[PDB]
From Swiss-Prot:
Family per record: Belongs to the CRISPR-associated Cas9 family. Subtype II-A subfamily.
Region (RuvC-I): 1-40
PROSITE patterns: HNH_CAS9 (PS51749)
Outcome when changing residue 384 to A: 60% target DNA cleaved
Official protein name in the record: CRISPR-associated endonuclease Cas9
Any GO MF annotation of the entry: RNA binding
Function: CRISPR (clustered regularly interspaced short palindromic repeat) is an adaptive immune system that provides protection against mobile genetic elements (viruses, transposable elements and conjugative plasmids). CRISPR clusters contain spacers, sequences complementary to antecedent mobile elements, and target invading nucleic acids. CRISPR clusters are transcribed and processed into CRISPR RNA (crRNA). In type II CRISPR systems correct processing of pre-crRNA requires a trans-encoded small RNA (tracrRNA), endogenous ribonuclease 3 (rnc) and this protein.
Taxonomic source organism: Staphylococcus aureus
Domain notes: Has a bilobed architecture with a recognition lobe (REC, residues 41-425) and a discontinuous nuclease lobe (NUC, residues 1-40 and 453-1053); the crRNA-target DNA lies in a channel between the 2 lobes. The NUC lobe has 2 endonuclease domains. The discontinuous RuvC-like domain in NUC cleaves the target DNA noncomplementary to crRNA while the HNH nuclease domain cleaves the target DNA complementary to crRNA.
Amino acid sequence: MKRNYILGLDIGITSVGYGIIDYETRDVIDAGVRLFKEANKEIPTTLVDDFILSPVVKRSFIQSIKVINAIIKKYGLPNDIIIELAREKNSKDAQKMINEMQKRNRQTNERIEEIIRTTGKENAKYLIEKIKLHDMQEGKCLYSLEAIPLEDLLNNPFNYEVDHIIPRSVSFDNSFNNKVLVKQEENSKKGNRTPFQYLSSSDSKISYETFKKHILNLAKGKGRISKTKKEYLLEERDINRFSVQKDFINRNLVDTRYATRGLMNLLRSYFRVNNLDVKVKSINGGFTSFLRRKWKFKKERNKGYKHHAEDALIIANADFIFKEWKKLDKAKKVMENQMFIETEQEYKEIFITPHQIKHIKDFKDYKYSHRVDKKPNRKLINDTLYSTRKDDKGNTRIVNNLNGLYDKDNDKLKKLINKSPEKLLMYHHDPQTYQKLKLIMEQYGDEKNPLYKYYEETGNYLTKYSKKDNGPVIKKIKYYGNKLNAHLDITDDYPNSRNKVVKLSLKPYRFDVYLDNGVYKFVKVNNLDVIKKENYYEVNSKCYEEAKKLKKISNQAEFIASFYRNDLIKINGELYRVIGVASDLLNAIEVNMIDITYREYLENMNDKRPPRIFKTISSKTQSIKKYSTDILGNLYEVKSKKHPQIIKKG
RNA sequence: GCUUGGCGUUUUAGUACUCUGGAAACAGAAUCUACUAAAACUUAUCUCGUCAACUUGUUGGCGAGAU
DNA sequence: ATTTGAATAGGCAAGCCAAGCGCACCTAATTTCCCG
DNA sequence: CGGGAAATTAGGTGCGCTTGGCTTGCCTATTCAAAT
């Protein structure tokens, strides 16, 4: 559209958030998320292949580019793009960082618990950050070097103040590493100067040399200070030099990782070459979280995928602040990589926005675009082998095995004997050993595992029945499991095998829905049913026609649609995304929600249902419709081809 | 692409182990439980145009439109 | 009027990921020995 | 007698092993409503 806008992006391991806002008013236009599985005319994706990355990151940059290309074609060229690459590099690194963060959140809260016991005051817990700075400094304000009593901080919270080591106006750093607990008078005297500049002036109580020695002694050994904090405390360069300010801006505002640099270089190159006035920027992972604390907007990653989108809208509003405030013009220019604030109150006033955050938080019309997998899954089948047997009723059944019979907490056999004694093969074939086992289960019924007590009390494993007491130990028990339906037969690998040798869990490729005289019906196509040829896969025709016959699908039945993983389905007027075929036999298909994983939907509600949706396709089913989202999450109601596909060249 | 081995799943061969013929050797059944030996484990949807694979009526890529 | 089918809850199992515990190896600080 | 360098001790880091949760495929079982 004619209207001019900003594009936020929150790039992640599995996701690319986007957020679109009016360049004049800062009202929300649009927002959504593009979701994908972690890789364990318009902007091309071949440039990502040029410069070397982790696979996990490499996928996201390809996905991001296609989301930018889709926004450009819909809304036209943005005025400003601004990007946030997630802190993590892969999911393991993410989890490690979350664990490290959680460990720190434990380390902070454990210090609170000890002091509120000792002192016995309530305003302590409100004073979150002033407590931890007392730990770092070893009980002394660093500018003066005089002692802080612990209760004196609680008695006089005014007479001490959290100071920024390097003025926030120059560094843009609000991190704990740029913070120090100091006396109120010392803060007032320092002003907008570094410790070096202040302690070199006539206003200071102590010499810089004394201070420097203290910091260096504080750095090594126990009660340690971070490298970044140490560097800030010992910053000697002229704050007022542009080169020095540039360094602070680059450290705090501009993200400094090889990937993030690589990405913005890709994008800026593209716009530069084609002569398109687009201002690509980036912001530091931490910085967004400051704005969330500032604007009272608790990061809830459990509040669906929208968190990625509502991160992008935040990132996009930061861009508005780095355009409307002439005092940030230097910072703006640094962030745009273009060739070339006096008080704390002034700094704080620049970033006050109460209004448009209500728009962001109360915004509703989000969109989601899950990516669809149509590659036959290398995993064909569970590799476990099962023997089979025909039971009393003449049903072929899977043979399972009970292992770990003599374990403390194993109730599998006790459950099975009480419910289904006829499920044991030994029930039919070794009655004398069966009767011998039943006497044990009756003897030590009260425990989880009767056999554990048999081993504990007597000190002897259970042996097969024998006339001379020389039968072998029993270490596994075979029992009849599932009725045998869809299986793979591998018995010709075992010459003269008495019983049939099989594998199970025929991993679905897709399911094809048919409308047959007003009744909705479907066929499952297995990965086994798909066979690699020269440069293509082929669905097996004979297995397919046999499958229709078990489902009683007529020759004059209309095909409706094929549904792969993450394909969208509207069942009785309710839209979902497909996982797969829960049960061919029962005619069930596994779906999920679109805006949130159904697990998380239930957790935010505090509901204790199973976290899976299953939808039965039946005489009761009234309409089935296929939908498809574009890469932005705009929804479309879509038809099918006349017949199902057989060959798959991709 | 080749070789070896420990743990696990399956089977055969032989022996142990249940049942019947037999004084006993020995044979048959049954195949449960074990020991010894061998083998194996990039793409959203439809429709149309166009091009190519070969399966010759289907598919995949690309362009346009719609959804 | 009774029998068959639908929808949801609850469990089993394979594969795969991730986090906490234990053993062996690597780096820095303090104490002891030798020289100005 | 005091300061600097080397050897020994204590603490921190990295690799490998194990268990619980997550994603998916599917069967058995229970309860209610519709069809022959």
